[PDB]
């Protein structure tokens, strides 16, 4: 699983819980929208 | 309904209430003007 379209609109906390459940090793980075990466 | 020109100038709270009434599933994202999407 590489994408989480079910998380659009949800909080960071709920996104993190869902991602770590699907992907235990995930390194979760939180950035404002529009941030150049 | 895809657009809400009646909400220009209104608060986020009033925009949200109106949008969710017209579109129950809406996932409401709030960004500063000028944000690149």
């Amino acid at each position: 699983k590489t994408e989480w379209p079910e998380l659009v609109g949800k909080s960071v906390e709920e996104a993190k819980k869902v991602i770590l459940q699907d992907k235990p090793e995930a390194q979760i980075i939180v950035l404002p929208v529009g941030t150049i990466v | 309904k895809t657009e809400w020109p009646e909400l220009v100038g209104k608060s986020v709270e009033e925009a949200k209430k109106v949008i969710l009434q017209d579109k129950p599933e809406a996932q409401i994202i709030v960004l500063p003007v000028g944000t690149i999407v």
């Binding site: 989480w4 960071v12 996104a15 404002p32 | 960004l31």
Partner: peptide
């Protein structure tokens, strides 16, 4: 492209604004 990383792009209320993807 980093397979263990997941970026969360958040709005002004810290809600997820875009679909999260590995990378």
């Amino acid at each position: 492209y980093r397979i263990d990383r997941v970026r969360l792009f958040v709005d002004k209320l810290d809600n997820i604004a875009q679909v999260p993807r590995v990378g």
